[PDB]
Design an enzyme around this catalytic site. Structure first.
Site, PDB file in Angstrom:
ATOM      1  N   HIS A 119      33.701  24.148  40.729  1.00 34.18           N
ATOM      2  CA  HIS A 119      33.322  22.714  40.493  1.00 34.18           C
ATOM      3  C   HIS A 119      34.010  21.750  41.471  1.00 34.18           C
ATOM      4  O   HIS A 119      33.607  20.604  41.559  1.00 34.18           O
ATOM      5  CB  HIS A 119      33.701  22.318  39.065  1.00 34.18           C
ATOM      6  CG  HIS A 119      32.992  23.211  38.083  1.00 34.18           C
ATOM      7  ND1 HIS A 119      33.494  24.451  37.718  1.00 34.18           N
ATOM      8  CD2 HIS A 119      31.828  23.054  37.374  1.00 34.18           C
ATOM      9  CE1 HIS A 119      32.642  24.986  36.825  1.00 34.18           C
ATOM     10  NE2 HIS A 119      31.608  24.176  36.580  1.00 34.18           N
TER      11      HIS A 119
ATOM     12  N   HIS B 151      37.295  26.206  32.704  1.00 34.54           N
ATOM     13  CA  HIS B 151      35.876  26.450  32.286  1.00 34.54           C
ATOM     14  C   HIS B 151      35.077  25.150  32.250  1.00 34.54           C
ATOM     15  O   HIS B 151      35.628  24.068  32.132  1.00 34.54           O
ATOM     16  CB  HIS B 151      35.865  27.103  30.903  1.00 34.54           C
ATOM     17  CG  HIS B 151      36.036  28.588  31.061  1.00 34.54           C
ATOM     18  ND1 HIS B 151      35.216  29.339  31.889  1.00 34.54           N
ATOM     19  CD2 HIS B 151      36.932  29.475  30.516  1.00 34.54           C
ATOM     20  CE1 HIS B 151      35.631  30.616  31.820  1.00 34.54           C
ATOM     21  NE2 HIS B 151      36.673  30.756  30.997  1.00 34.54           N
TER      22      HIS B 151
END
Length: 107
Positions: free
Chosen positions: A11, A99
């Site tokens: 990310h 996560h």
């Protein structure tokens, strides 16, 4: 299972335009279904988690640019770049969101 280094390549990004067709076939992506990157530094981004010790779901307060990659259907591992502006829900522990819970809202 995952660490901050994984979320870094998953990310976190240092460019708006990313190379997905070259990373997707690697062992880190192993030809995934889709990915969502963010245009910002890990200092101020991880700074938000500065304090979290156990696993918890947090949503970014600042909206950043997001370079995601969706694998087109009926195609042999082909990614498509998509830019947008929004927040992200992530699971943070040890001051590191490893996560991805979701985007904008967290179910």
């Amino acid at each position: 299972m995952q660490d901050w280094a994984t979320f870094k390549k998953k990310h976190l990004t240092d460019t708006w335009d990313v190379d997905c067709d070259n990373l997707m076939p690697t062992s880190l992506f192993d030809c995934k279904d889709k990915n969502t990157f963010i245009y910002s530094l890990p200092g101020p981004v991880k700074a938000l988690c500065r304090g979290v010790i156990f696993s918890a779901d947090v949503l970014s307060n600042s909206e950043f640019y997001l370079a995601e990659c969706n694998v087109k259907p009926r195609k042999p591992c082909k990614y498509k770049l998509k830019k947008s502006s929004n927040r992200i829900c992530i699971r943070c522990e040890h001051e590191l969101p490893v996560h991805f819970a979701g985007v904008g809202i967290c179910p």
